[PDB]
Design an enzyme around this catalytic site. Structure first.
Site, mmCIF file in Angstrom:
data_model
loop_
_atom_site.group_PDB
_atom_site.id
_atom_site.type_symbol
_atom_site.label_atom_id
_atom_site.label_comp_id
_atom_site.label_asym_id
_atom_site.label_seq_id
_atom_site.Cartn_x
_atom_site.Cartn_y
_atom_site.Cartn_z
ATOM 1 N N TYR A 128 -9.052 9.018 15.617
ATOM 2 C CA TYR A 128 -8.741 8.684 14.232
ATOM 3 C C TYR A 128 -7.908 7.440 13.955
ATOM 4 O O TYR A 128 -7.004 7.082 14.710
ATOM 5 C CB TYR A 128 -8.042 9.867 13.552
ATOM 6 C CG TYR A 128 -8.707 11.211 13.760
ATOM 7 C CD1 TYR A 128 -8.012 12.259 14.361
ATOM 8 C CD2 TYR A 128 -10.019 11.441 13.337
ATOM 9 C CE1 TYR A 128 -8.597 13.505 14.539
ATOM 10 C CE2 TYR A 128 -10.618 12.685 13.508
ATOM 11 C CZ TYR A 128 -9.899 13.711 14.113
ATOM 12 O OH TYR A 128 -10.481 14.939 14.301
ATOM 13 N N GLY B 70 -5.079 5.084 15.612
ATOM 14 C CA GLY B 70 -4.417 5.467 14.380
ATOM 15 C C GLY B 70 -3.938 6.905 14.449
ATOM 16 O O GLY B 70 -4.160 7.595 15.448
ATOM 17 N N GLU C 149 0.829 -1.200 0.000
ATOM 18 C CA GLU C 149 0.000 0.000 0.000
ATOM 19 C C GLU C 149 0.868 1.257 0.000
ATOM 20 O O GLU C 149 2.094 1.175 0.068
ATOM 21 C CB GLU C 149 -0.898 0.011 1.245
ATOM 22 C CG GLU C 149 -2.374 -0.220 0.966
ATOM 23 C CD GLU C 149 -3.088 1.037 0.486
ATOM 24 O OE1 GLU C 149 -2.538 1.750 -0.382
ATOM 25 O OE2 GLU C 149 -4.208 1.309 0.972
ATOM 26 N N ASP D 65 -10.773 1.259 -2.802
ATOM 27 C CA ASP D 65 -9.639 1.527 -1.923
ATOM 28 C C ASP D 65 -9.001 2.860 -2.322
ATOM 29 O O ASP D 65 -9.707 3.838 -2.569
ATOM 30 C CB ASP D 65 -8.613 0.384 -1.998
ATOM 31 C CG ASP D 65 -7.764 0.259 -0.726
ATOM 32 O OD1 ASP D 65 -7.649 -0.869 -0.205
ATOM 33 O OD2 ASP D 65 -7.202 1.271 -0.254
ATOM 34 N N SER D 66 -7.675 2.899 -2.417
ATOM 35 C CA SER D 66 -6.971 4.140 -2.744
ATOM 36 C C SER D 66 -7.149 4.636 -4.177
ATOM 37 O O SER D 66 -7.440 3.866 -5.095
ATOM 38 C CB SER D 66 -5.474 3.982 -2.454
ATOM 39 O OG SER D 66 -5.267 3.218 -1.279
ATOM 40 N N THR E 262 -6.439 11.035 19.883
ATOM 41 C CA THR E 262 -7.450 11.236 18.847
ATOM 42 C C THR E 262 -8.122 9.897 18.541
ATOM 43 O O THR E 262 -7.515 8.836 18.697
ATOM 44 C CB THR E 262 -6.821 11.778 17.538
ATOM 45 O OG1 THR E 262 -5.998 10.762 16.943
ATOM 46 C CG2 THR E 262 -5.968 12.998 17.823
ATOM 47 N N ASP F 48 -1.611 9.587 17.996
ATOM 48 C CA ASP F 48 -2.459 8.398 17.974
ATOM 49 C C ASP F 48 -3.446 8.137 19.117
ATOM 50 O O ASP F 48 -4.628 7.890 18.867
ATOM 51 C CB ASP F 48 -1.583 7.157 17.765
ATOM 52 C CG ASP F 48 -0.465 7.038 18.791
ATOM 53 O OD1 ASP F 48 -0.185 8.025 19.503
ATOM 54 O OD2 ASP F 48 0.145 5.954 18.874
ATOM 55 N N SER G 264 -9.179 3.079 17.175
ATOM 56 C CA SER G 264 -8.927 4.480 17.466
ATOM 57 C C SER G 264 -7.458 4.868 17.586
ATOM 58 O O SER G 264 -7.142 6.056 17.574
ATOM 59 C CB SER G 264 -9.617 4.867 18.777
ATOM 60 O OG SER G 264 -8.904 4.345 19.888
ATOM 61 N N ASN H 242 -11.732 5.749 2.733
ATOM 62 C CA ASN H 242 -10.456 5.138 2.387
ATOM 63 C C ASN H 242 -9.657 6.022 1.440
ATOM 64 O O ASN H 242 -8.785 6.775 1.868
ATOM 65 C CB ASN H 242 -10.718 3.775 1.739
ATOM 66 C CG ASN H 242 -9.465 2.924 1.609
ATOM 67 O OD1 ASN H 242 -8.375 3.430 1.348
ATOM 68 N ND2 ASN H 242 -9.627 1.615 1.765
HETATM 69 CA CA LIG Z 1 -6.041 7.967 16.900
HETATM 70 CA CA LIG Z 2 -6.086 2.896 0.969
#
Ligand SMILES: [Ca+2]
Ligand SMILES: [Ca+2]
EC number: 3.1.1.-
Length: 322
Positions: free
Chosen positions: A131, A108, A44, A232-233, A129, A126, A106, A181
């Site tokens: 996120y 991330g 990725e 996805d991306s 937040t 990380d 969470s 995503n």
């Molecule tokens: Ca986070």
């Molecule tokens: Ca992606």
């Protein structure tokens, strides 16, 4: 490489608003470009630096790879100290920004570092937040939009947020998205494209000049994807076409600037269940040659990069800004 399968502006691919089905799209099969490993790695985050070198990673082991497109030489400068990195976006100043999912609930966030793994910076902390960030895209001012990769089909915890150029403020752009995503900005940066993986939807968001407010009735759903697992991306080309890697489908779909499908790129072996994990598309700087990473983890296979020529040369994103 000029003899690669190519996408042309012929037939309905040359229409502003083509009425067509996926099975009818101009389609081509990608060519193997470079095997990253015989082992299964969740590839990725494709991104080229100012010198045209390719950076990518694998989610589960967290390896950061650097590849010489010319020599095909593969190096492994460093390993992410954060769990489950999912994307790499290079800053205009050279730093590598790495989005990670953490525990998928969470933990991330986003961190920055040199191409050698030095000067680790917490762009988006990380633990403080909620996120879980899958991808991001820098605007010309140095700010960036990121996707909150959380929730599932009927539990839309995800969304898109904008981080000011000084990285001190985070502003919600659009929420209630079932696992945001992919994300991309149009060449004029007035349109934001977002893929919602678990709901199989493509979002087109028209922004006001401030970059944060949505124009009246400006967030729409121009396309409903189909098939397991989902979009996805994505990345764009100089003609504002959008290339969307389809996770679990072994293909990439291409849309014109209005959000209509105009092309399709298949990954060799998909019919047999191989290389279905197509996750990210990216152009070799200054060219229309596209690279796509996929892996055969599901079938106990390896990790491979594929290639084809797109409709136009890649767009000059932030890292290439002068
Ligand atoms: Ca986070
Ligand atoms: Ca992606």
């Amino acid at each position: 490489q000029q003899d690669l399968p190519t996408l042309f502006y012929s037939g309905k691919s040359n229409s502003a608003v083509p009425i067509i089905s996926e099975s009818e799209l101009q389609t081509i099969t990608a060519e193997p470009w470079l095997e990253i490993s015989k082992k299964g790695l969740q590839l990725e985050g494709l991104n080229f630096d100012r010198q045209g070198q390719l950076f990518l990673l694998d989610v589960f082991e967290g390896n950061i790879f650097k590849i010489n497109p010319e020599t095909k030489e593969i190096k492994r400068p460093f390993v992410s100290h954060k769990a489950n990195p999912a994307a790499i976006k290079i800053h205009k100043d050279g730093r590598l920004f790495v989005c990670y999912l953490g525990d998928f609930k969470s933990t991330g966030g986003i961190f920055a570092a040199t191409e050698n793994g030095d000067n680790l910076q917490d762009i988006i902390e990380d633990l403080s937040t909620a996120y879980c960030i899958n991808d991001m895209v820098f605007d010309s001012k140095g700010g960036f939009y990121f996707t909150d990769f959380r929730g599932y089909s009927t539990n839309p915890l995800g969304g898109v947020y904008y981080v000011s150029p000084d990285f001190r403020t985070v502003t919600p752009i659009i929420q209630n998205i079932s696992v945001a995503n992919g994300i991309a900005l149009s060449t004029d940066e007035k349109v934001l494209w977002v893929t919602e993986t678990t709901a199989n939807r493509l979002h087109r968001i028209a922004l006001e000049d401030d970059g944060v407010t949505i124009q009246p009735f400006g967030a729409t759903i121009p396309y409903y994807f189909t098939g397991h697992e989902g979009p996805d991306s994505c990345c764009i080309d100089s003609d504002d076409n959008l290339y969307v890697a389809m996770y679990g489908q072994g293909r990439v779909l291409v849309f014109n600037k209005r959000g209509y499908p105009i092309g399709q790129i298949l990954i060799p072996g998909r019919d047999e269940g191989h290389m279905l994990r197509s996750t990210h598309p990216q152009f070799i700087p200054g060219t229309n040659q596209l690279i796509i990473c996929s892996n055969d983890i599901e079938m106990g296979g390896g990790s491979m990069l594929y290639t084809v020529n797109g409709f136009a040369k890649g767009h000059q994103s932030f890292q290439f800004q002068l």
